[PDB]
Design a protein around this ligand. Structure first.
Ligand SMILES: *[C@@H]1O[C@H](CO)[C@@H](O[C@@H]2O[C@H](CO)[C@@H](O)[C@H](O)[C@H]2NC(C)=O)[C@H](O)[C@H]1NC(C)=O
Ligand SMILES: *[C@@H]1O[C@H](CO)[C@@H](O)[C@H](O)[C@H]1NC(C)=O
Ligand SMILES: *[C@@H]1O[C@H](CO)[C@@H](O)[C@H](O)[C@H]1NC(C)=O
Ligand SMILES: *[C@@H]1O[C@H](CO)[C@@H](O)[C@H](O)[C@H]1NC(C)=O
Ligand SMILES: *[C@@H]1O[C@H](CO)[C@@H](O)[C@H](O)[C@H]1NC(C)=O
Ligand SMILES: *[C@@H]1O[C@H](CO)[C@@H](O)[C@H](O)[C@H]1NC(C)=O
Ligand SMILES: *[C@@H]1O[C@H](CO)[C@@H](O)[C@H](O)[C@H]1NC(C)=O
Ligand SMILES: *[C@@H]1O[C@H](CO)[C@@H](O)[C@H](O)[C@H]1NC(C)=O
Lengths: 262, 109, 109, 269, 109, 109
């Protein structure tokens, strides 16, 4: 989990004076509870957006938008805490909205947007907004939570993001499997611009059977920089698959397979 | 010691979060699991997402559940900060609790 | 050294109210000892996947499956200032707990 | 809709002074809105209790329980409005819980009760608690409504209620039909209202009316109140038409014509 | 003598911005005139069931059904004080609107 | 006329509530109807429970829907009070709306 940039995060809207702060996900209100607390947020909504940084890199971003309620508890609202929790690895990224001015007018509905949380592809997070001050012990929740599922590089727009390109989401192996005599197989494929080794896996299944009677591994060494994209070749159902070893996916990349019948 | 001082400015030493290196393995694993959220308003971290192994046997290459191998959770002991009731002399307590992080496929004894 | 509360609002008083999985797994992992005398816990057992693939019934490495680590962010304590057995500082470190076996994503032509 | 009795309705609890007042369901807040409004009630529950009265009358009441949210808007909660609306006929009966003190703490949950709303057997109501002041135009609801189903006279505690006894819930006619060469004997209630005997002859096993006849038992005198009355009826002379249904309809004051009837059947063999 | 909004909190200035079913029904109802020159609406047609039972296909009265009234609580304006052309007071009255045909609840022995 | 005076201290002329005389006919009727809620916070009354006829025909003695007789709604023009927007030279407006309060069975022409 990371923020898009260390730049100034604009968070003040006309009529409000807000401030964005780094947040160790703990809170002073949690340490020191306050008697009078605001209520839960309303209409939490997390969408997927894409942001270009000044360096030309495009990243997926969790665009969060929420709103307040019209009850008078707005008079005791000193801020919000926006937290993103990665579900598999319990990583937390928190950002604190601190309200400098007191929110007393309900003339217009209040809407808060934050679109600087970088999100990894094919991932699942929990996005929560906690209205600070946090409640006293054995009090009402006053926070809102949602689950944000972010698709893989097979998604049409996500195939062009920097994370997906780093793992070779645009890789086109251009496989050619030709059956040469003496039971030989010649397999030719293209190389992506990364100095890492490749795995060729050959499996010889029977014509109609969910088993194998022959397996073979061959290791393609790391190609030289002067051979970044140049094609390379290696000399009854024969299934041959390339597994790359990119630095993004160490051994869990997207494989590319080919099958030859009897 | 019985009572120690804790500075709650949690130092984020997990700095190398910029690389994108992982994914969700609760579906592609030989021992898949469901995600159960554990929420405690009086505890930090409040929400901990634990693993509950989906089956009692793993998944073979055919996709059918094979019962010769066991899906066992990978348990971890993690420190938790808990808010104490007002009658206690110390407002906070550091405890150790067991959480299931994932599930792995093992050969039975 | 610190032993009492002060205007520092985030330094609080805390009451210190304190095996064959790696070898029988289809995705076995070795345990690495991480020893910091200035950190509680003093010893952490990191998990490093033994094989790039998973082991099959015969014990050989299955190249059709991925042995991927399961890691988790945890909270630990560090003495601050150093060598003080009473003043600490909460800290977040990303550590690897285990290794699991996952089927890869295969894109057919 | 009615209140149980005009006694002093007390809502005061330790730490809160309040009065239960009469209120038409058009509040002052609706006419003149105010910016600061409290939160909606939490955990609204409606139960069916049974309450007595000085004359020994047992009535069905709608016990209402609700709780306050923990947010700070309790500083601006000026009270509640409890309303019951009948669905078939849009009848409104509402009372106002006016708080005479500003609830400020949130130590243990504030729980509010009201058990003075007499309900009718076999009816559906909408019971709502509207926190006062009411929301400004184009605002959040700030009220909690729930539907209430009062069962019919067949329910055990329902049956012994005054409204149910009024409609003859404890009345067993004990209809006996004896066929002659038809005499219907039935016991009368203690109300001076006329009774209706409907004698319908169907075929042996066909759902059709091959004969229909009517008899009118006049309102009995008080001397004939809990007595057995017998009426003899002459039947048609046909074949196959042998299913005789004698249905007795009372005309008690509680239900003019839509009362509970009691039927007896005589078959062919 | 009311023409403006004085300090009377519930007296307001309001902008007065104002067939064969009874005969073809199985439970026909007569419309009885209720006229009041001091009320708005002045004339209301209250429904009174034309029969105790309903009317079957043959046109005779069916004694197995009940012709029961459907009533409503409606809002009407009554002059207060009387003879004031532009002073009214809200009122709630129960009017019989229709007649419907219902199956009686029967208790068999 | 164009503007009048209305006293909103509602006088309840439906004072005959001691006699309990009512039932739910929306199920037992030969032309049953579903009750639908009509909520308008900007209107008094804020909630009105109207009727929608369940069928186009009517339930005959066999419990089946005859299609030679029509289920029509009994509609009554009711007076309601509505809160005008704050950009009008009047805070309230008495309106006539058409409300279906029940359903009846009628014979086609
Ligand atoms: C409810 O009303 C009673 C009566 O007015 C209040 O009792 C008074 O409390 C004050 C402050 O403690 C005393 O000075 C008076 O002598 C009390 N009067 C009586 C007659 O007892 C009571 O405080 C009110 N409760 C709340 C919560 O406001
Ligand atoms: C926000 O700060 C500016 C600083 O000049 C001030 O002029 C403005 O009034 C503030 N806004 C509010 C709502 O107080
Ligand atoms: C917030 O955290 C980021 C990442 O550690 C860091 O680069 C930045 O300087 C921090 N800002 C503040 C105000 O602490
Ligand atoms: C690798 O080649 C692709 C074209 O196939 C190009 O889009 C990408 O920028 C290249 N990356 C590097 C690091 O050269
Ligand atoms: C409400 O009004 C009725 C009739 O005027 C009266 O009997 C009753 O006591 C009143 N109740 C309250 C709480 O004012
Ligand atoms: C009903 O009448 C029959 C005969 O007339 C009698 O045997 C029976 O006891 C009566 N039932 C009751 C409850 O009295
Ligand atoms: C009718 O009888 C019942 C008991 O069977 C009694 O409770 C009721 O008071 C009686 N009615 C009258 C008017 O006496
Ligand atoms: C009803 O039966 C009794 C005897 O059980 C008899 O005396 C009386 O005459 C009968 N009623 C009529 C109307 O004949």
């Amino acid at each position: 989990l990371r923020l898009l940039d260390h730049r100034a995060l604009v968070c003040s809207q006309p009529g409000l004076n807000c401030t964005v702060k780094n947040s160790t996900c703990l809170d002073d209100s949690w340490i020191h509870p306050r008697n009078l607390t605001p209520s839960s947020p309303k209409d939490l909504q997390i969408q997927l957006h894409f942001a270009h940084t000044q360096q030309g890199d495009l990243f997926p971003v969790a665009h969060i938008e929420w709103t307040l309620q019209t009850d008078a508890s707005i008079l005791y609202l000193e801020g919000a805490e926006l937290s993103v929790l990665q579900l598999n690895t319990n990583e937390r990224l928190c950002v604190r909205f601190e309200f400098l001015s007191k929110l007393r007018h309900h003339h217009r509905r209040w809407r808060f947007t934050f679109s600087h949380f970088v999100v990894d592809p094919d991932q699942e997070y929990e996005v929560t907004v906690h209205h600070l001050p946090k409640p006293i012990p054995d009090g009402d929740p006053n926070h809102q939570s949602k689950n944000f599922l972010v698709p893989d590089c097979e998604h049409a727009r996500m195939k062009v993001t920097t994370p997906c390109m780093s793992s070779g989401s645009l890789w086109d192996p251009n496989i050619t499997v030709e059956t040469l005599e003496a039971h030989q197989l010649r397999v030719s494929f293209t190389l992506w611009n990364e100095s890492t080794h490749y795995q060729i896996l050959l499996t010889s299944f029977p014509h109609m059977e969910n088993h194998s009677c022959f397996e073979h591994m061959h290791h393609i060494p790391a190609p030289r920089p002067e051979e970044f994209h140049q094609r390379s070749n290696v000399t009854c159902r024969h299934q041959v698959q390339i597994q790359p070893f990119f630095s993004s996916c160490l051994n869990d990349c997207l494989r590319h397979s080919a099958t030859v019948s009897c | 010691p019985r009572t120690v001082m804790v500075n709650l400015n949690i130092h984020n030493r997990n700095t190398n979060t910029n690389p994108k290196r992982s994914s969700d393995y609760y579906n592609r694993s030989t021992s898949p699991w469901n995600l159960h959220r554990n929420e405690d308003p009086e505890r930090y971290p409040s929400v901990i997402w634990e693993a509950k192994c989906r089956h009692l046997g793993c998944i073979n290459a055919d996709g059918n559940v094979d019962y010769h191998m066991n899906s066992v959770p990978i348990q971890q002991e993690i420190l938790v900060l808990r808010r104490e009731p007002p009658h206690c002399p110390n407002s906070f307590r550091l405890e150790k609790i067991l959480v299931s992080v994932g599930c792995t496929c093992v050969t039975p004894i």
